[PDB]
């Protein structure tokens, strides 16, 4: 099965130079020996091979120290269902370019009740486990459904009712900690973000958060007020967009759109193409063939 995966010659040179440096210093586990993983790290450091090797080396140590490589095996987040009740978030379908749509209803987050049911350390470990699913299962599924290389998401943050008066230091510090893990270990995995239902109270939340955010990430973020429905329908088909955001989806037989995890990674035929199907990338296939 042929997947549209255009490789730039300049990037082909840069990525293979970077890979040879990683191999020569025993920094390349075969589980991370993918053109596209290495390209995301190079892009995050503007193809500076010295800074990228440091970034890569810190990520390897991080995965060793955090236990990321055994997190599927090791971590059972048994409070999951309770957390969802006070933190509504999920993947739901794809945008018109085939990227997964990730939603959070931050207006419906109950900070007090969330800290009764979980800890910040556990929520972060859960976040890392979901990212491992996102890069190993959900994004490759999207590659197959679109017949096109996909490795980044469209995110919607619903911030209805969120104002600066009740924007707390722990809320801010969690965002910083999540972004640090994401920038350090999962770079170039956000395509764009739409922050919707921002009231006048949100203006200072956005002001303060921008002070800590990676500036390339800020350039990918669009903050919208209450009239957001048409902008989302421009970039997401109505069938892939929950009705409460202006689409036609209800996921009625699956507990509503926020609990369905709807997307091509729920399709058994697409999942079968991931587990025991051709390699998705013709350069990895060529490298693995040659070696």
Is 102 a binding residue for ligand PX6 by CB under 6 A? The answer is yes
Specify burial of residue 260 (Cβ count, 10 A radius: 0-12, 13-18, 19+).
Answer: buried
**Which does residue 109 bind out of ligand PX6, Ni ion, none, counting CB within 5 to 8 angstroms by kind?**
ligand PX6
How many helices (H) does the chain have, and how many strands (E)? 15, 5
* Encoded tokens for 46: 């503007």
**Hey, how many other C-beta atoms are within 10 angstroms of the C-beta on 245?**
23
Q: How many CA atoms lie within 13 A of 218 on its CB side?
A: 10
Nearer to ligand PX6, 72 or 212 (CB): 212
- Taking the complex as a whole, how short is the minimal distance between the CB of residue 179 and ligand PX6, in angstroms? 6
Task: Report CA-CA distances (Å) from 226 to 40, 180, 198, 229, 245.
Answer: 34, 30, 7, 8, 10
Identify whether the C-beta of residue 159 lies closer than 8 Å to the C-beta of residue 195: yes
Residue 29 binds ligand PX6, judged by CB under 6 A: no
When the beta carbons of 209 and 245 are compared against ligand PX6, the nearer one is: 209
Q: What 8-state DSSP symbol labels residue 135?
A: I
Site string for ligand PX6, 133-172 (x = CB under 6 A): -x------------------x-x-x-x--x----x--xx-
Contact 139, 100 (CB under 8 A): yes
Residue from 71, 101, 251, 273 binding Ni ion (CB under 5 A): 251
Q: Does 177 bind ligand PX6 (CB under 6 A)?
A: no
- 281 makes contact, choosing from Ni ion, ligand PX6, none, with CB < 5 to 8 Å by partner type, with Ni ion
C-alpha atoms less than 13 angstroms from C-alpha of 212 in its C-beta half-sphere:
14
Q: Which of 22, 42, 209, 249 binds Ni ion (CB under 5 A)?
A: 249
How many chain residues bind Ni ion (CB under 5 A)?
5
Which of 257, 258, 270, 273 forms a contact with Ni ion (CB under 5 A)?
Answer: 257
- Binders of ligand PX6 among residues 111 to 130 (CB under 6 A) are 111, 114-115
Rounded CA separation 279/117 (Å) = 41
- Which CB atom, from 152 or from 217, has the smaller least distance to Ni ion? 152
How would you class 70 by CB atoms within 10 Å of its CB: exposed for 0-12, middle for 13-18, buried for 19 or more? exposed
179: left (phi > 0), else alpha (psi -120 to 50), else beta?
alpha
Residues in 46-85 at the binding interface with ligand PX6, rule: CB under 6 A = none
Contact residues: ligand PX6, CB under 6 A: 102, 104, 106, 109, 111, 114-115, 134, 153, 155, 157, 159, 162, 167, 170-171, 174-175, 178-179, 182, 189-190, 193, 195, 205, 209, 213, 217
Contact residues: Ni ion, CB under 5 A: 5, 249, 251, 257, 281
């Amino acid at each position: 099965l042929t997947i549209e995966d255009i490789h730039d010659v300049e990037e082909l040179r840069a990525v293979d130079e970077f890979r040879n440096l990683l191999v020569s210093e025993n920094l390349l586990p075969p589980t991370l020996d993918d053109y596209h993983i290495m390209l995301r790290f190079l892009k995050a450091r503007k193809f500076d091979i010295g800074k990228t090797k440091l970034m890569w080396s810190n990520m390897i140590k991080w995965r060793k120290d955090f236990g990321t490589d055994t997190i599927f095996e090791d971590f059972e987040f048994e409070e999951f269902d309770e957390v969802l009740k006070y933190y509504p978030h999920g993947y739901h379908g794809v945008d018109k370019e085939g990227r997964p749509v990730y939603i959070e209803r931050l207006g419906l987050v109950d900070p007090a009740k969330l800290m009764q049911v979980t800890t910040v350390e556990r929520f972060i470990r859960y976040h890392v486990r979901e990212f491992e699913k996102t890069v190993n299962i959900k994004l490759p599924a999207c590659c197959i459904a679109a017949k096109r290389h996909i490795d980044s998401s469209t995110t919607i943050l619903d911030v209805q009712g969120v104002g600066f008066k009740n924007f707390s230091k722990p809320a801010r510090d969690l965002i910083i900690q999540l972004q640090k893990i994401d920038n350090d270990n999962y770079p170039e995995t956000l395509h764009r973000m739409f922050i919707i239902n921002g009231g006048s109270g949100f203006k200072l939340v956005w002001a303060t958060v921008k002070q800590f955010l990676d500036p390339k990430t800020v350039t990918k973020i669009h903050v919208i007020g209450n009239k957001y429905q048409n902008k989302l329908l421009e970039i997401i088909d109505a069938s892939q967009l929950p009705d409460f955001l202006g689409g036609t989806c209800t996921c009625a037989d699956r507990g509503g759109c926020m609990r369905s995890d709807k997307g091509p990674w729920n399709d058994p035929e697409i999942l079968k193409m991931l587990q025991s199907g051709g390699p998705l990338c013709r350069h990895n296939s060529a490298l693995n063939s040659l070696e």
